[PDB]
Structure 1
Amino acid sequence: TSWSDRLQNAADMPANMDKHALKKYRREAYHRVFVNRSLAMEKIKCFGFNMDYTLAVYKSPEYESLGFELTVERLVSIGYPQELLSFAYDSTFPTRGLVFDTLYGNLLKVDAYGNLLVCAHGFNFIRGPETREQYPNKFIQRDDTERFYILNTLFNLPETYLLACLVDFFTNCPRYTSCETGFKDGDLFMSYRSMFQDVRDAVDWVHYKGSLKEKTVENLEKYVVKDGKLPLLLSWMKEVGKVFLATNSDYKYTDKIMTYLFDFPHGPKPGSSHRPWQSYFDLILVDARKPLFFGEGTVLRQVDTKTGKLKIGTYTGPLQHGIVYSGGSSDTICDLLGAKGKDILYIGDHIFGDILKSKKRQGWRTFLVIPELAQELHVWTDKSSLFEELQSLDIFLASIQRRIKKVTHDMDMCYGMMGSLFRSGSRQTLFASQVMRYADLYAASFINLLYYPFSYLFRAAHVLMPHES
């Protein structure tokens, strides 16, 4: 059972819109909205969305596997060895939010301070003492952004696994000589950095120039979660406020995906007339180029929705019914909707490009969707005794240290080879820390908002400093 299996299972339920029944779905932690900072929902006037991995949740591991296969085929097409074709995507290896160290070719799981939690070179998990040769202080400078690449999104899962596959392959293939910073192949030297860049370029290529979008849209039922509650929730949002879409995807792809997401023989509720997807939005904006969108952005363009091409020129006109925008900036949204940042709840899956940047640059309210949480919560509750044991081992304070390392490993392995998205044993990950700091609300799915009234006061406890406690 993958995280998307859980989400599609919950998607197959029709909404019992009885108020006591609505409250009741929160009986499961799976259906809750979690709160880092208090948020009075009655103050939200605009609900903003992105599409990819938020409205359109790609099915796992099928979609990752497709991305992986196509990225591999692109690398082979540009001259990587044929052996790459024998790789096959393994969903048990990657966890999201890992850092690829381009100097030494390691995948690292780090905390908020850049401290090393896990280090894998290919499929070799390097124990603490061995990591000290390359990381003398068990630490990386996180924002040495030329050296370290943070794999933030679900789109990065295939390349997370591929990077490890490639390092493993080249290390164990006798044609190549392993060196500190890459591989020697006679009179050719392939640095981990150049290899990484080839992988990044190939992933971008499959999405923008290759066949990934075409193959997705060919079999939407295989690749995209569909939920009749999505149009319902969106209709309720539009009754109390304004609704907008700001997607990094282009119009033609957005139209195909959104059409599928709304393709039911009814509108918001069974028995109601079907309405086009565009009717659910007061403002539709594509080619957003987030995170740049939240700064200077790009010139505002208008999409010709008949051809899917941009009209020539900068668009200087007003918000009109049926207009679709391209580019622009977050100020375009605020201006056209008559909103200030704190009147906006932006629902994002990109912790950096949606959530951190909208919060920090614009003071928007934020809702982070974390699709894996569905499965992570299951593991978290199912294996509660392991964490509980770890806590009491940490408490017990006058060997033992090695029992802590044992229990940490067993707990971590329940999630996969790279552990929980949120922690390694008792240490929180960078990702966890960024969720807490920048996501006002978070959940497995934004659909969970269906189970709360729009007057709800989401509450978090006031924080006190140690000297105040």
Structure 2
Amino acid sequence: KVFVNRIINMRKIKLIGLDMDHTLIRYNSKNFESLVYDLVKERLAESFHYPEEIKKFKFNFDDAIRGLVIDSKNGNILKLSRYGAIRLSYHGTKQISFSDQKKIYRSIYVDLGDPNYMAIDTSFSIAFCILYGQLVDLKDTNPDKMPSYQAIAQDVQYCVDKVHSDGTLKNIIIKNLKKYVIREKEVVEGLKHFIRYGKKIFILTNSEYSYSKLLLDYALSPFLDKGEHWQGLFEFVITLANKPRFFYDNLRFLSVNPENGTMTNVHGPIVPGVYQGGNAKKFTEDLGVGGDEILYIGDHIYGDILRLKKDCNWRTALVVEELGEEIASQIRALPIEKKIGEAMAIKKELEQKYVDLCTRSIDESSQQYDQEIHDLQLQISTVDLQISRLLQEQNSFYNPKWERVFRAGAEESYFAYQVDRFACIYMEKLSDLLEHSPMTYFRANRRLLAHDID
């Protein structure tokens, strides 16, 4: 239910901070992504005068997965490993051959230090990868009509940001709430469960208060009892947090009058209430607590991991919605996984008898097992072909284009690495955590190195 990377004693936590959207309030990711895609697509032709055709682009949710990286320079989308090696790549929607991948990058690795790459985990990655993919396909068709790959990417990023602060996005959903947000009673039960154990919960969102009030009201209030209000659930509600800068920057707080919505500058320490802007530094101080006593839970890293972890110090946990289907798919592939595990053991011992009757014809003899081993080279190619098919069968249980989110080839993917480094704890959704005792001591499993003995 809850996965541990680093120890975190919930008994030592006095405040739990929650991202409002996608963390505290769940959204139908498929609909939400589709919506953002349509708006950004529309906005491209409306303010950037992109080719008419794009309005006709079909949105396929499975065209991308979470954790992908795009290099704005070459209009490519890559799935990297934990150390930045290219597992697979596409130029637009056209896959790049391993051969040509190496000719393109002069290496199997890439350097994310190079800003020409977009490697930040964001809540729109998927939509942005799908639109960008087909967006560079158009570009190729008639280079003279559309800007450059790096220009296109910057444009899409701009539209994606504008629409979020434009009001465009929030309005469409605030009027189709039942379609975009999925309510969950367990969430309010969990918050009450934790508050009941002395925990103080606060939320910080990049959304304005007016819109935040409407949303919390719709997704929390209904599950409350008579005489209860969602406002009593949170010690603080920081709006327009301006994450990630909120964590390591120094932007000032604005006290928000919950009624009229007007604000005043903050003088002195902050007190339970509604604010806008701010920074973790001042907030941790005013609360008179140590950063290791504060736990923040978000849905996306949304920033550079080293600066976030070094320049902040709050314990950080992650909610990874894609985990739902990832786990589900692995449980489904169990029987297939087993059939290849045994088809490997056979290829192993069968390949072992091959080197044996091999380290003879040229280690003790000089010719005698010539035909003896040849029967193994054919019997080994057979057990191999079986494995290729069994692998095809396994992939069918995952995204057909990009495979799993946490795996890149057989090792952990670049995204798996980000979760591991950024999060001490991660789960599918917020309630998975609230299900546990507010005084739980989370322990990580012993990693175990290659030269370690059981």
Could you tell me the TM-score, scaled by structure 1's length?
0.82
- 1:444 counterpart = 2:425: no
Q: How does 1:355-370 map to 2 (within 5 A)?
A: 358-370=308-320
Aligned position for 1:434: 418
Q: Quick one: which of 154, 161, 183 aligns to 1:226?
A: 183
Q: Hey, what's the Cα distance between the residues in 2 that align with 1:125 and 1:405?
A: 20
Q: Hey, what's the Cα distance between the residues in 1 that align with 2:299 and 2:100?
A: 35
Aligned position for 1:248: 206
Q: Quick one: which of 154, 164, 170 aligns to 2:139?
A: 170
Pairwise CA distance, 1:37: 1.8
Q: Quick one: which of 238, 247, 256 aligns to 2:195?
A: 238
Pairwise CA distance, 1:366: 2.2
Q: Quick one: which of 134, 149, 153 aligns to 2:122?
A: 153
Could you tell me the TM-score, scaled by structure 2's length?
0.85
Pairwise CA distance, 1:464: 4.9
Q: Given that residues 234 and 280 in structure 1 are in contact (C-alpha distance below 8 angstroms), is that contact kept between their aligned partners in structure 2?
A: yes
How much is the aligned-residue C-alpha RMSD, in angstroms? 2.5
Q: Quick one: which of 123, 132, 156 aligns to 2:93?
A: 123
Aligned position for 2:397: 414
1:10-35 deviation digits (Å, cap 9, x = unpaired): xxxxxxxxxxxxxxxxxxxxxx1111
Between the two proteins, the alignment pairs up a number of residues equal to: 417
Aligned position for 1:96: 66
**How has the CA–CA distance of structure 1 residues 135 and 40 changed in structure 2, closer, same or farther, with 3 Å as cutoff?**
same
- 1:296 counterpart = 2:249: yes
Q: Given that residues 120 and 301 in structure 2 are in contact (C-alpha distance below 8 angstroms), is that contact kept between their aligned partners in structure 1?
A: no
SS at match of 1:190: coil
SS at match of 2:63: coil
Q: How does 1:286-325 map to 2 (within 5 A)?
A: 286-311=239-264, 314-321=265-272, 323-325=273-275
Pairwise CA distance, 1:376: 1.2
Aligned position for 1:184: 144
- 1:259 counterpart = 2:209: no
Pairwise CA distance, 1:201: 0.7
**How has the CA–CA distance of structure 1 residues 418 and 388 changed in structure 2, closer, same or farther, with 3 Å as cutoff?**
same
Greater Rg by CA: 2
Identity, % of aligned pairs?
Answer: 33
Q: Hey, what's the Cα distance between the residues in 1 that align with 2:113 and 2:341?
A: 31
Q: Hey, what's the Cα distance between the residues in 2 that align with 1:294 and 1:401?
A: 52
Q: Quick one: which of 232, 238, 243 aligns to 1:279?
A: 232
SS at match of 1:44: coil
Q: Given that residues 46 and 339 in structure 1 are in contact (C-alpha distance below 8 angstroms), is that contact kept between their aligned partners in structure 2?
A: no
Q: Hey, what's the Cα distance between the residues in 2 that align with 1:75 and 1:452?
A: 45
**How has the CA–CA distance of structure 1 residues 105 and 298 changed in structure 2, closer, same or farther, with 3 Å as cutoff?**
same
Aligned position for 1:55: 24
**How has the CA–CA distance of structure 1 residues 297 and 129 changed in structure 2, closer, same or farther, with 3 Å as cutoff?**
same
1:357-410 deviation digits (Å, cap 9, x = unpaired): 554333322221001111111111101244456666777555688887776665
Structure 2 gaps of 5+ residues are 352-380
**How has the CA–CA distance of structure 1 residues 408 and 253 changed in structure 2, closer, same or farther, with 3 Å as cutoff?**
farther
Q: Hey, what's the Cα distance between the residues in 2 that align with 1:70 and 1:381?
A: 36
Q: Given that residues 301 and 328 in structure 1 are in contact (C-alpha distance below 8 angstroms), is that contact kept between their aligned partners in structure 2?
A: yes
Q: Hey, what's the Cα distance between the residues in 1 that align with 2:35 and 2:389?
A: 35
1:120-160 deviation digits (Å, cap 9, x = unpaired): 11221122112122112122111212x00025123222111
- 1:76 counterpart = 2:76: no
1:173-207 deviation digits (Å, cap 9, x = unpaired): 4xx1xxxxxx334xxx7210001111111111111
- The code of the aligned residue for 1:260 comes to Y
Pairwise CA distance, 1:82: 1.0
**How has the CA–CA distance of structure 1 residues 258 and 332 changed in structure 2, closer, same or farther, with 3 Å as cutoff?**
farther
Pairwise CA distance, 1:39: 2.4
Q: Which range moved further: 292-301 or 96-105?
A: 292-301
Pairwise CA distance, 1:222: 0.3
Aligned position for 2:169: 212
Q: Given that residues 121 and 164 in structure 1 are in contact (C-alpha distance below 8 angstroms), is that contact kept between their aligned partners in structure 2?
A: yes
Q: Given that residues 245 and 283 in structure 1 are in contact (C-alpha distance below 8 angstroms), is that contact kept between their aligned partners in structure 2?
A: yes
Q: Hey, what's the Cα distance between the residues in 2 that align with 1:388 and 1:135?
A: 36
Q: Given that residues 202 and 237 in structure 2 are in contact (C-alpha distance below 8 angstroms), is that contact kept between their aligned partners in structure 1?
A: yes
**How has the CA–CA distance of structure 1 residues 360 and 394 changed in structure 2, closer, same or farther, with 3 Å as cutoff?**
farther
